[PDB]
Ligand binder design. Structure first.
Ligand SMILES: Nc1c2nc(Br)n3c2nc[n+]1[C@@H]1O[C@H](COP(=O)(O)OP(=O)(O)OC[C@H]2O[C@@H]3[C@H](O)[C@@H]2O)[C@@H](O)[C@H]1O
Lengths: 468, 269, 76
């Protein structure tokens, strides 16, 4: 722990302002604000200096400077739970390899087989109970049986609260492998209510954090059920959304890394499941579908979700601006009154570009058809998205098998990979079998023995040396 | 539901063992034909005395006051409009009440009273405004009398004009400093006119003025003087600030004022 | 204030049945601190109702913080 305590301030940087330029608009009860107004008359932790000029309109990257970071450590919530949660403070712009090295090496996390990135509405809302139970049970089930990271916003409001309650339900069950469900939360350093207690240099190893819901301003509190916290910092107190340019970079850097076990090697797949949402959620869905990440949108209980769930079945040219505005008005009904007519063309253009990629998007259709479970829906969407990829030769049907053997579950590979339309020779089934032989998975061995591999032809001399 | 005076149409008139005629929603307005309307003629026993109107038995020619005009010490003129007069008796402008006579009100027509409301923000421990999901929080200064079982706004009968600030606050606020707060009572208006009440007959009803004095800053200013004007209890039980909510425990019709008050600032409900 | 959501809990613990308090009192929309769950728990401890004790232990009261000296004198 002391080596970690040495390692963190040497590698990680944070931003801070050095120049005090007073703001025109005085804040509520904090009238003195020097364009960030952190905690002083001067938004600085430096000497009050003229700095050879009074540069008005302080340019953000030209004003603030990087320094070693002090807020790192471990945290506990005062009176809610007795477990410990690691947490750290990073700058706005760091290389993602540093963050990945910190997560895997020093915090003690293995490489994930799957990366689920949940996003939704930050404003609080309510939902139907049966769909709530199905959503909680399905998400907890897939993240348990896969060994997957869950990355989300680290706030107490909105969809992040529901993911926290699902994790709290699994910790109430607590059958086996409590360290399997790890959830990280990425939040802005400015909008944390009791952040002054966290600041202690050279290691705040037990850090007691109190929380009080509804006793706060526009800034909000952290969630309690999350397990790891990453707090990005620009050096600006009154701002939202500094974590958004870092989350996409971190997820896209993770999605090229290769976890190799046994003979086979895969690249880590990434999927995002979306709920009720807002405009930023729709922009996130569009930014994900441009890159190729599959999306799962749950029908019901949503504004932006139930827009897409209705409009998805109709063709792209049939979508028109008046139809989009009419369905927007019935679902929003207050913001739709406050919305302009100049944004709805942008929204229908974005919805047309999203539904135009028919493969990468999947709608939940809760209850009606195909609603076996959330986990099989997420897995089927991910496997369909990997199927839709361009490929030379038949490497794709091999790659789906390596993915389905990397995950422990066998019913998915039985249901669709071996059902129809590959016409494979059994020799090509050989190298994954070795992996299924090494990692003690007898069900896959039984499946491959049923599907036709001959054990007399498989076991040769060099593969016997490899198995020993 | 049609916006009718359902608290006046309420059966079993208060503090008098009498019942009123059943007036359903079709029957309420004076324009629509209602032939079997037989409202009993009832006035309180203490309505034949002094100050209050001698028109409790106004079949006699003692009913000679000026109607919808200021008839001397009683400014009997409605905020809503010129009320129709039948047989020397005023009719209620909103509809039938099923009860004829003077009831327990002072005079016929409207009975002008005043309800002022003082609003302030709710600060946290640091001093910033607390919040619900979208809107903000409001606090108002309300008073509970020892024999009401209901918190109420600090407003009384406006038998005097400018001393009705002091008449509402004689037992509550002060005597000398009360005139100083009456100087500061010139604020912004919200709603004037007819108000629902269980003490409303066909001839006597209540019209009111709703002024809204507000405190913006929650630090050092006029509020220190309003807290310094505390001579709280002379003949009252308790008086305190209270956070606004729909489930605010208050008098029944007075919440209808606050539902009109929180629209003037943008609070939640 | 929030005395009503406390009063419904005292009513549902006064009646012996636990499914009612599970179904609607603890389902949604109170956002309570566990310390405020303390005084009814004592009653559920006294009248030999183990199901309510299991429910409150599930819902988050810490037994280390709950049992203090004066409440130990009260329980004895
Ligand atoms: N992390 C946050 C976030 N935290 C807070 Br307190 N807010 C946030 N807005 C965006 N996000 C991230 O951006 C994504 C899209 O958010 P959306 O478009 O659905 O947000 P709306 O419901 O329209 O605004 C809610 C209000 O809360 C504020 C916003 O500034 C705004 O004032 C979220 O999933 C989340 O990851």
């Amino acid at each position: 722990q002391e080596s970690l305590s040495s390692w963190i301030p040497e590698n990680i940087k944070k931003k801070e302002c050095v120049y005090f330029v007073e703001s025109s608009k005085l804040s509520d009860a904090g009238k003195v604000v020097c364009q960030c107004g952190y905690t002083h008359e001067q938004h600085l932790e430096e000497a009050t200096k003229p700095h050879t000029f009074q540069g008005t309109q302080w340019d953000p990257k030209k004003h603030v400077q990087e320094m070693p970071t002090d807020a790192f450590g471990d945290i506990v919530f005062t009176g809610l739970s007795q477990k410990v949660k690691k947490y750290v403070r990073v700058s706005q712009d760091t290389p993602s390899s540093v963050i990945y090295h910190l997560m895997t090496q020093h915090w003690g996390l293995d490489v994930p087989n799957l990366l689920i990135s949940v996003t939704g509405g930050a404003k609080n809302f309510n939902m139907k109970p049966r769909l709530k139970s199905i959503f909680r049970r399905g998400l907890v089930k897939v993240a348990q049986t896969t060994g997957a990271w869950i990355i989300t916003g680290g706030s107490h409001t909105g969809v992040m609260k529901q993911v926290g309650e699902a994790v709290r339900d699994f910790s109430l069950s607590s059958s086996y492998k409590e360290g399997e469900l790890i959830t990280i939360g990425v939040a802005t350093w400015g909008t944390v209510h009791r952040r002054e207690g966290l600041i202690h240099p050279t290691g705040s190893f037990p850090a007691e954090y109190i929380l009080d819901e509804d006793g706060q301003g526009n800034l909000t509190c952290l969630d309690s059920n999350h397990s790891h916290f990453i707090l990005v910092d620009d050096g600006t107190h009154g701002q939202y959304g500094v974590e958004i340019p870092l989350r996409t970079r971190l997820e896209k850097f993770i999605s090229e890394q290769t976890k190799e076990r046994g003979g086979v090697a895969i690249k880590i797949p990434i999927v995002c499941v979306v709920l009720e949402g807002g405009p930023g959620t729709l922009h996130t869905i569009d930014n994900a579908t441009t890159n190729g990440t599959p999306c799962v949108v749950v029908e019901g209980s949503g504004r932006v979700a139930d827009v897409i769930a209705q409009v998805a079945n109709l063709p792209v040219s049939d979508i028109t601006i008046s139809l989009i505005q009419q369905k927007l008005s019935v679902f929003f009904q207050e913001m739709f009154e406050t919305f302009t007519e100049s944004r709805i063309v942008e929204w229908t253009k974005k919805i047309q570009d999203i539904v135009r990629r028919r493969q990468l998007l999947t709608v939940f259709r809760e209850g009606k058809d195909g609603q076996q479970d959330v986990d099989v829906a997420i897995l089927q969407a991910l496997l369909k998205a990997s199927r839709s990829q361009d490929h030379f030769g038949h490497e794709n049907w091999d790659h789906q098998l390596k993915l389905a053997v990397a995950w422990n579950r066998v019913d998915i590979a039985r249901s669709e990979i071996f059902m129809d339309e590959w016409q494979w020779k059994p020799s090509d089934l050989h190298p994954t079998m070795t992996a299924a032989l090494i990692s003690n998975k007898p069900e896959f061995v039984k499946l491959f023995l049923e599907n036709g591999v001959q054990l007399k032809e498989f076991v040769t001399w060099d593969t016997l040396l490899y198995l020993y | 539901g049609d916006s009718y005076h359902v608290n006046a149409r309420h059966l079993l008139y208060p503090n008098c063992p009498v019942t009123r005629f059943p007036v359903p929603n079709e029957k309420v307005p004076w324009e629509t034909e209602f032939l079997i309307y037989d409202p009993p003629f009832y006035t309180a026993e203490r309505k034949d005395a002094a100050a209050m109107d001698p028109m409790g038995d106004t079949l006699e020619p003692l009913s000679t006051i000026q109607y919808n005009v200021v008839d001397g010490l009683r400014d009997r003129r409605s905020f809503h409009g010129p009320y129709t007069v039948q047989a020397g008796l005023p009719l209620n402008p909103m509809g039938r009440t099923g009860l004829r006579g003077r009831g327990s009100l002072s005079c016929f027509g409207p009975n002008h009273t005043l309800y002022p409301m003082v609003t302030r923000w709710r600060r946290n421990e640091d001093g910033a405004i607390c919040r619900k999901s979208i809107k903000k929080m409001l606090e108002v200064l309300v008073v509970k009398l020892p024999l009401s079982e209901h918190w109420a706004l600090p407003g009384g009968s406006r038998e005097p004009g400018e001393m009705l600030p002091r008449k509402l606050k004689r037992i509550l606020r002060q005597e000398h400093w009360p005139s100083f707060e009456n100087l500061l009572k010139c604020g912004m208006e919200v709603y004037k006119g007819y108000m629902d009440d269980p003490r409303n007959t066909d001839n006597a009803w209540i019209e009111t003025v709703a002024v809204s004095v507000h405190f913006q800053d929650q630090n050092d200013v006029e509020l220190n003087r309003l807290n310094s004007n505390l001579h709280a209890c002379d003949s009252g039980a308790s008086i305190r600030w209270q956070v606004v909510d729909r489930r605010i425990p208050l008098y029944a019709n007075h919440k209808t004022l606050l539902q009109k008050a929180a629209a003037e600032f943008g609070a939640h409900y």
